[PDB]
C-alpha cells in the first residue's frame with residue numbers, strides 16, 4: 001500500500017503545516033500537524049475542556065462505530081516550545097491520503113495549553129518520530145508510520161514541504177518526479193528517539209563551505225532552523241543591522257534587508273536554503289524589525305533542522321531495519 005496527502009501552511013509565515021487525516025467510522029476529518037520530532041497522535045476532542053477549544057475541529061469517539069476506549073491508558077506531553085496537552089486514549093481507524101491503519105491509538109485531549117487553544121488551524125498532532133518516544137502509559141503505543149510500515153510497498157515516508165505553498169507527505173513510495181538530481185542518504189541514530197543525523201557543514205550566501213560535523217534532528221514540527229551559536233553568528237554577521245535580542249527572544253534583522261542563502265551539507269551533497277525562507281516577518285504588527293529563521297540552539301540541548309531547512313529539500317524518512325535519512329534538492 002501507499003498513501004499521499006497534501007500538507008498546507010497554516011499561515012503566511014509557514015509557522016506550521018497541516019495535513020487532513022480521516023479518523024473513525026464514518027470518517028471525521030481533522031487537520032493535523034505531522035511532527036517528525038514526536039511520537040503521539042493526539043487530537044482535540046469532545047473530551048477537551050470546553051474553554052480550551054476555540055475553533056478547532058474535534059474528534060468525537062462516541063460517533064465512531066470503530067472507536068474503542070483503550071482502558072486505563074493516559075498520555076501527557078510537553079514540547080520544546082513549552083506547550084503541553086494530555087488526556088485518555090482510544091483505538092480507531094485512521095487514514096492518511098488513502099493509506100489506512102486499523103487499531104491506531106488516537107490520543108484524545110482532555111487538556112491543552114494556551115498556545116494550542118490559540119491556534120484554531122491545528123486540530124492535533126500526528127507524531128512521526130520513533131515509537132520509543134510515545135507517551136501513552138501504562139502501555140506505550142506505536143506511531144501511524146510504525147503501524148503502517150509492514151503494509152507499505154517500501155518502509156518509508158517522505159516530506160516535501162512548500163515555501164509559502166502546499167506540499168506533500170507520501171507513505172510507502174518515493175516520487176521520483178518530486179526532486180532534482182539524486183537523493184543523498186545519511187546515517188541516523190535512534191538512541192534519543194529522533195531522526196538524528198550529522199550534517200557535514202555549512203556555507204553562508206556565496207561564501208566558502210565550512211566542513212564541520214553538526215549533529216541534529218530532522219523535525220517537521222519545528223518552524224525554524226536551530227544551530228550552534230558559532231554558525232548562527234556567522235550567518236547573521238552577513239546581514240547589516242542584525243542582532244540578537246534577549247527581549248524579543250532571538251536574532252532580529254531590519255525588514256528592509258535582503259537575506260543571504262544558507263547551505264547545509266548532507267554527506268558530499270549540499271542543500272541551499274534561499275534567503276527569503278529565513279524571513280519570518282515583523283516581530284509585531286507594523287514593526288520594521290523582522291524575526292530570523294535561523295536561531296541559536298544554545299540552551300535547547302540539540303540542533304534542530306526544522307521547517308526552514310526541510311522545506312528546501314525533498315526528505316526521505318527511511319524506516320528500514322537500519323533507518324536512514326535522504327535529502328535531495330528540488
Ligand SMILES: COc1nncc2c(C)n(C)c(C)c12
Pocket residue numbers: 015223224248249280281282283284290291
Ligand atoms: C515574527 O515571528 C516571530 N516573532 N517573534 C518570535 C518568534 C518566535 C519564537 N518564532 C518561532 C517566530 C516565528 C517568531
